[PDB]
Design a protein around this ligand. Sequence first.
Ligand SMILES: CC(C)[C@@H](C)/C=C/[C@@H](C)[C@H]1CC[C@H]2C3=CC=C4C[C@@H](O)CC[C@]4(C)[C@H]3CC[C@]12C
Ligand SMILES: CC(C)[C@@H](C)/C=C/[C@@H](C)[C@H]1CC[C@H]2C3=CC=C4C[C@@H](O)CC[C@]4(C)[C@H]3CC[C@]12C
Ligand SMILES: CC(C)[C@@H](C)/C=C/[C@@H](C)[C@H]1CC[C@H]2C3=CC=C4C[C@@H](O)CC[C@]4(C)[C@H]3CC[C@]12C
Ligand SMILES: CC(C)[C@@H](C)/C=C/[C@@H](C)[C@H]1CC[C@H]2C3=CC=C4C[C@@H](O)CC[C@]4(C)[C@H]3CC[C@]12C
Lengths: 602, 602
Amino acid sequence: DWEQYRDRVNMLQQERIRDSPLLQAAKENDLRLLKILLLNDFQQRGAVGETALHVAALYDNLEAATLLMEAAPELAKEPALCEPFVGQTALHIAVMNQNLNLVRALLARGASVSARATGAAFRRSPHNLIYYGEHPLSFAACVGSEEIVRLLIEHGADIRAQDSLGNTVLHILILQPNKTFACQMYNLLLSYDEQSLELVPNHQGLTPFKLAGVEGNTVMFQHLMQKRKHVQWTCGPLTSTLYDLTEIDSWGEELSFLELVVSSKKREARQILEQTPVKELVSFKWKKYGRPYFCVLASLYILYMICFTTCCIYRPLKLRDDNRTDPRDITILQQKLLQEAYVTHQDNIRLVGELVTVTGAVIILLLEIPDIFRVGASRYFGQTILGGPFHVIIITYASLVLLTMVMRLTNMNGEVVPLSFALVLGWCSVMYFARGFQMLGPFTIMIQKMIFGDLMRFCWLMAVVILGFASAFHITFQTEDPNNLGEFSDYPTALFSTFELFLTIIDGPANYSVDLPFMYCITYAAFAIIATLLMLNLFIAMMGDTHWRVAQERDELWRAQVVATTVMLERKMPRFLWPRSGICGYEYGLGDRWFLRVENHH
Amino acid sequence: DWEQYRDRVNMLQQERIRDSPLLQAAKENDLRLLKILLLNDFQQRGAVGETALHVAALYDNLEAATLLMEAAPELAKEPALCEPFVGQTALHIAVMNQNLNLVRALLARGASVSARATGAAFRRSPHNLIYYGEHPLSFAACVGSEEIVRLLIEHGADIRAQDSLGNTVLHILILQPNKTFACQMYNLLLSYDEQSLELVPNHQGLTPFKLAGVEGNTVMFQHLMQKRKHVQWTCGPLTSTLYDLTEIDSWGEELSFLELVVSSKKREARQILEQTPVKELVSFKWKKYGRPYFCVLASLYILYMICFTTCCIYRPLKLRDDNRTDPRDITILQQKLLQEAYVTHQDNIRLVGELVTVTGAVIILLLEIPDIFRVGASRYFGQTILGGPFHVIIITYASLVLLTMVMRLTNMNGEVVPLSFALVLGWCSVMYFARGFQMLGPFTIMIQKMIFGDLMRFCWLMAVVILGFASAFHITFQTEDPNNLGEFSDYPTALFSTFELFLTIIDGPANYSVDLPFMYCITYAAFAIIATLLMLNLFIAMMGDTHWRVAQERDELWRAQVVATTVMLERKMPRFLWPRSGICGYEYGLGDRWFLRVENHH
Ligand SMILES: CC(C)[C@@H](C)/C=C/[C@@H](C)[C@H]1CC[C@H]2C3=CC=C4C[C@@H](O)CC[C@]4(C)[C@H]3CC[C@]12C
Ligand SMILES: CC(C)[C@@H](C)/C=C/[C@@H](C)[C@H]1CC[C@H]2C3=CC=C4C[C@@H](O)CC[C@]4(C)[C@H]3CC[C@]12C
Ligand SMILES: CC(C)[C@@H](C)/C=C/[C@@H](C)[C@H]1CC[C@H]2C3=CC=C4C[C@@H](O)CC[C@]4(C)[C@H]3CC[C@]12C
Ligand SMILES: CC(C)[C@@H](C)/C=C/[C@@H](C)[C@H]1CC[C@H]2C3=CC=C4C[C@@H](O)CC[C@]4(C)[C@H]3CC[C@]12C
């Protein structure tokens, strides 16, 4: 694995230092021995192709480093050579150690300011505890050294330089934990840009501004907004400000800033939506267009489900041609064949409802399937914010409807099976529209967080308890007459009865007109204590204990689902229903830009 | 008892001081009277064989002590003589009182630095509020007096000296509450050791390092780690450190450090497992070997339970030879005798499943019973962390399986009884494997903490309520026809029905075709209010109120169960499946030691 390999690389590096007297002296800073060694091989390389001057820079030994450079000035220009450290120079190491005097001493000897630390230790990865890109300037900026950054710019470090992810030093600063020092560095780097470095995309296609949204860097986002706002006036406690919408509203682009924020896997990304500019734009969009249109789509989908339900109530059945020869058989009706299912005016009225049902199932797939491809299936079905579990069940519903149509056209028996699933999944998918309402939306997120959390854990241990007790009840009743107590008469019935008895949805079996086996009363007393008194009430207790913890995240997720709905509706609906948001600058001599005006009290 | 004896010892001591003018003067420090007394018996002894110089040292009376020593220098060498205080000298007392000048005055007169306070007041026990071992140096160290410790070392106090538990001053310092001052003292004492005192075991077989793990002394453990770590390099925000695994991983030893920590009765011991070295070693062991092998053992045990369950479903039964002459008798099948139970190919297929069932029951006892002997039964079955309640039920399961085999071989009727218990206990023991999963493990600890806590308290008061109401319902129905209401027709049925009615698992008995006794409606209304409205819902309330309090400990116990599982699997499984953990130093010129490399951000 990567851990045992990186560990071995570090062990070999330390051994090759111990085993080589020049590298050992470069580590210890014992100038005595280092003078004797250098007085009479300077190109000695440690385990990763690093020089004695890399070793001196790592241990921050300026005296050993200057003594090595006086003996062999060429060492300042040397990269390391083996996979984790490829392209790392002594300048990269000195910059990480913030040794300004060693950085001056290396630059005075022509250490390259444009050298790339290409190796696996510098790539953005869960394997690496930091990501500073590949260039000495990016290292100096992430390390927070203003003076080393100026010094590197004065030696001609290219501020536009991009690493193997396409990230510029501005993208790399958005990715750092030290957000306030990163904002101070971001102004310093923007000062040397006199087309802008803020507009350069990485290989994901993201500008620094879009990356601050995706990564949920609210401190860098509100900093980037200071160059995109204009204060129109202040009057006593009131200010009117005008915010440039260009990089937020993302007009005509296939993948907007707001879509990149609501579809981001970073939990912090949803905090960008609470910023004054994003929140007030998405609140306006939801008030004026999103809620009205989402209420119309909720209404149309409910009418479509009432239509489909009515087609199931009026489903074509006839008297069974076969005989109920078995006394346990209760089936009296049967499916009509296709050639006898469409005869009456009522069958033609149902054919219109069935054609509406099939048309809406086709429309669901035409609306759903392209968004799987845009978003990618694991992000599309996985994200709560986008509607993930509802997309699974609405596609499953449309698939079961089209399967049922194939069964109807082919005289296939058993339409009850896909129709019963489609009635449950079709109606449960009406809970998708709960996101439009503050009353229902946060509660629908609790339902989901309880299904994937507490209900999952419970059903795993509940199933183990049901297997034990169903088997004990079944073998307890194997010797007894099934007509006097039916609940455990075969093993599938014993499982189902034990499941219903666990949940207390069927009464505990009793028949006071006969002697039940004594082992039933013993087993059922233990079951009643374990399943109903303890586990069924402990479920309520652990749900109550989850509920108060999850409640703050439930509300943050609901507010983000409203924005994701707004972004989805504006993307998918006809543009004549969604007029461009904010204020057109061309009406006021401000150019082609669009704005949001926010007036606030302070 | 010990309390009334120690109290009497203290009362007699104070009386013998009051009754003896020299000891009374040694307590008061009235040098006037003490001069008159000493001018013309110095060997006067208080209630515990203590001298007037012990009394002067106890009351911290340096002037009386020096005046007593000037009259009788031999008193500095005297021990106390009666059971609680045997071997205590005036030096032990002066050291506890931190009187450096009295310690100098006693050492100047040859008070023994190697004297042992052998008496019952100095032994590690719940009877004693402190434990400083038996020697003046251990007293000075636990009292925290650096200057008295140096002074005693300068007078030749043996730093290797061991008390009646085999504890050295280092072991005794791990046992003190003042952990940060104890670490400062631990460095001072290690400085005089120039085979090491850190390697000396006590009579439990524990070194100071193992004792810090067992006692959960995380402050002393992280201090002891500072002499067992090497910083390989630091580069900007990153450091790589190498930790010596020798005393943690405990190779080839019959009882490891990690086993001593997970099996400790101290609740603080589980905090040692969260230290960087222990946590990262046990996390690696669990990731690479523990979880994969525990998932295989979970799978094999579930397949074994499905096999046993199938042998119970296909259990050999025939039509009853006897007649159902009683109209209340519902038994229609009976056990086959052994000589008719193995005839068909299906019986031979079941014999293979029954031989697998018996083989796994023998294997369970071969795996379980030796670990009872290693750990000791009360620690083995008592500890949640080790699997205690699951070890009880898995041994009970294997015992019921082997009992059932003896019943099968002997034509003994009633195999339903041990098989019904074995099906419940065998399946409920699958919850042992819940510890391997973050989803199920903490919840399985809540199940256990609720069974032993809230369910226990509830079942005690619930039983008292059922006894009252079952008796009232039984005598209410004694005069009435059992065929019209069967629930209370005899006292065992009335108990069982009242138990099912308490839990609301059977419907309240009613028969609108007859007049029930009016006393039933009155009694059942009171029962319905007390049992179902109040107590059954108050159970949910007290569980909810336990759940939020226990939730932090539940997670700490789960994280410790994962480590205990890892330690158990590595101990019990073949060593070719468990390669030695960490980094072999011999590959890198570091010797025979093994290491963990931890790289961290700061
Ligand atoms: C035998 C059939 C009828 C079985 C398989 C049916 C199961 C359905 C009812 C289950 C499967 C997944 C469940 C489910 C998935 C996720 C969510 C999202 C949550 O925010 C609201 C509830 C909701 C919508 C629930 C409702 C009930 C569903 C849809
Ligand atoms: C406890 C958790 C794990 C939940 C999810 C599981 C419930 C189990 C016990 C349920 C789920 C569906 C149930 C089920 C489905 C349908 C039938 C067909 C019927 O003719 C006999 C019973 C039988 C075979 C029952 C047995 C019990 C089952 C398998
Ligand atoms: C009449 C028989 C069937 C009676 C005696 C059976 C009782 C069983 C089901 C009881 C006895 C002890 C109970 C028990 C003991 C302790 C634990 C550990 C806990 O972390 C998970 C639940 C678990 C495993 C439960 C499950 C149910 C058990 C095993
Ligand atoms: C309320 C708590 C204390 C729980 C643990 C106790 C429940 C009691 C009421 C249960 C446990 C087992 C039950 C029980 C076992 C088996 C039988 C044999 C049956 O032919 C008559 C009823 C009888 C005798 C009932 C009576 C009620 C008992 C004794």
